[PDB]
Design a protein around this ligand. Structure first.
Ligand code: FAD
Ligand code: ANN
Length: 565
């Protein structure tokens, strides 16, 4: 039987599986609940990514509980269910976080092996810069020296231009005090306006399955099983005086018989920030009171399981624009779509290689803001962001379909440094029931205050000379007036959503410590033979879309595992 069992063939899981099997005497079994990622056009052509989830066979079909912060709205909580995990359904944006993110991870765990300097080696293992699809000149769009040249995942600058690009660039000159240009987020200094970098190579998605699993497919010491949902982690004895969890039960679907397998060395949980805590709770690792309320016997009492959930909340906003070059008609007119698809199929170029956004702004509140009377600074540090602003050459709104008429650009914000914390809990002891996902969005004055400020910032940005002949008006009339705080707050509470970056539900913390679920080496506290390598270990929201930091967790996790062999 196998040396390791990896639960979840996801963003991080695939790194662990591929890295461990580099050694021919180490065998790994990967168990993935979902289907194959092969022959999924929507998971290959970059521009088609937003259609893939939430309501589909490639999604877990999770939702949140009703959010009082959102006027009682419950929202979709998409999560990839397939080879590659969420890296097969994500929007491919790549950055690693701020130096302050990783230094805070090191400080909070007492482990300097996290920390900005010591993590850089894994950027180089993880990524290689390849040409953008349109083969444009990337000089001055990034800094080659801070990025990998040889690593597994293909990354590139935007493969298709938009009419937004020159106008965003002009705004960095015209409004340089607020919206200065940033040469590369890979410096660990996120603030300012940078060109998007994305996990796209030869005009198609570079996911954790394409980058790690596929090249490793002919290895006899690696097995990958799809349609295999792990339903229980099995207490398989007592090694080192602690309960051991080296066996798992899995099934194809609800009501199907369960297969048992055991790892000789360790079970690695890579089920992600939703999947990991819920499986733990189903296995009797969690909050005693919550477990017994649903009929589960607690084997390891740890109330941190599924707590300390952070996410980046999302705010969408569309604006009518005077342009015939937005991407909107690709999704309305079959002739245009089919011309673009033929070009993508034959040459791997054209509009289908385009990203959700070619530029991103990372921004702080003024250091003298009224909110700092009542709150300490929740940012990772003085060089980190409070919010993000994303510029898209089309309609983008997770909860409202694209209008039949109109050309649009969208300005999407993410709250990067929330004060709010949430939790993930079991509604029942049945592994095929949906969990209760309660992020507690907009439940603090800080979080709503910052979002009101973000909107005012967006409107300053778009009032610039570069936009004069382009932006017509906001889709929603509550965005007509920058001084109307009541209208702005109403807009936010009715439109806010999620940008799909949950972390923290199995937080790392120092060995033997207060709260947390895992040690700094990612071993589960109070258990032997169980390791967590995914987004759930990160104790704070980073200054980054989460694929980049999660890949670093995956690469270091693999080295941590090899060190105990
Ligand atoms: C719509 C969307 C867009 C996004 N866009 C971006 C972006 O542009 N840039 C960015 O950086 N990030 C983005 N993200 C976030 C990023 O995709 C995730 O944060 C990251 O990929 C998660 O990595 P992970 O390894 O923690 O989990 P995942 O990649 O989600 O992996 C978990 C895997 O485990 C499987 N699994 C779960 N439970 C079980 C079980 N019991 N048994 C067996 N298998 C199981 C799942 O099916 C999945 O394959 C996006 C996310 C979404 C939902
Ligand atoms: C509006 O564009 C984006 C870009 C990235 C993401 C993400 O990281 O999920 C969401 C929306």
């Amino acid at each position: 039987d196998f040396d390791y069992v990896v639960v979840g063939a996801g963003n991080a899981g695939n790194v662990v599986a591929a890295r461990l099997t580099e050694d021919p005497d180490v065998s790994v079994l990967v168990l993935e609940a979902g289907v194959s990622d092969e022959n999924v056009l929507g998971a290959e052509a970059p521009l088609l990514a937003p259609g893939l989830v939430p309501n589909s066979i490639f999604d877990w079909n999770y939702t949140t509980t009703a959010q009082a912060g959102y006027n009682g709205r419950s929202i979709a909580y998409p999560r990839g269910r397939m080879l590659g995990g969420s890296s097969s359904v994500h929007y491919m944006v790549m950055m690693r976080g701020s130096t302050e993110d990783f230094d805070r991870y090191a400080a909070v765990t007492g482990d300097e092996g996290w920390n900005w300097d010591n993590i850089q080696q894994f950027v180089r293992k993880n990524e290689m810069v390849v040409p953008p699809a349109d083969n444009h000149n990337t000089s001055g769009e990034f800094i080659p020296a801070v990025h990998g040249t040889n690593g597994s995942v293909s990354i590139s600058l935007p493969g298709f231009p938009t009419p937004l690009d020159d106008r965003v660039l002009a705004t960095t000159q015209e409004q340089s005090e607020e919206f200065f240009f940033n040469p590369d987020m890979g410096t660990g200094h996120p603030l300012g306006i940078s060109w998007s970098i994305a996990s796209v190579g030869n005009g198609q998605r570079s996911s954790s399955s394409t980058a790690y699993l596929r090249p490793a497919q002919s290895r006899p010491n690696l097995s990958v099983l799809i349609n295999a949902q792990v339903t229980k982690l099995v207490n398989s004895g007592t090694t080192n005086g602690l309960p051991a969890f080296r066996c798992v039960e899995y099934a194809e679907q609800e009501g199907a018989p369960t297969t048992t397998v055991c790892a000789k060395k360790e079970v690695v949980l890579s089920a992600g920030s939703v999947g990991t805590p819920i499986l733990l709770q189903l296995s009797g690792i969690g909050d005693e009171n919550d477990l017994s309320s649903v009929g589960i016997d607690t084997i390891v009492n740890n109330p941190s399981v599924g707590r300390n959930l952070s996410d980046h909340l999302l705010l969408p906003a569309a604006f009518f624009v005077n342009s015939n070059q937005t991407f909107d008609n690709i999704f309305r007119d079959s002739s245009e779509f089919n011309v673009d698809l033929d070009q993508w199929t034959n040459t791997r170029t054209g509009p289908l290689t385009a990203l959700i956004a070619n530029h991103l702004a990372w921004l702080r509140l003024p250091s003298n803001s009224s909110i700092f009377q009542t709150f300490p600074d929740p940012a990772a540090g003085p060089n980190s962001a409070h919010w993000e602003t994303i510029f898209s050459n089309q309609w983008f709104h997770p909860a409202i379909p694209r209008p039949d008429t109109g050309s649009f650009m969208s300005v999407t914000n993410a709250l990067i440094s929330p004060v709010a914390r949430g939790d993930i809990k079991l509604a029942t002891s049945n592994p095929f029931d949906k969990p209760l996902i309660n992020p507690q969005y907009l439940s603090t004055e800080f979080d709503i205050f910052t979002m009101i400020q973000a909107v005012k910032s967006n409107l300053r940005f778009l009032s610039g000379q570069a936009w004069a002949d382009f932006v017509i008006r906001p889709f929603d009339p509550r965005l007509r007036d920058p001084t109307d705080d009541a209208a702005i707050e109403s807009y936010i509470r009715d439109n806010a959503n999620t940008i799909f970056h949950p972390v923290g539900t199995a937080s790392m913390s120092p060995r033997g410590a207060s709260w947390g679920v895992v040690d700094p080496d990612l071993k589960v506290k109070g258990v032997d033979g169980l390791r967590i390598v995914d987004g759930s270990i990160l104790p704070f929201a980073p200054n980054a879309h989460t694929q980049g930091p999660i890949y670093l967790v995956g690469e270091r996790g693999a080295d941590l595992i090899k060190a105990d062999q």
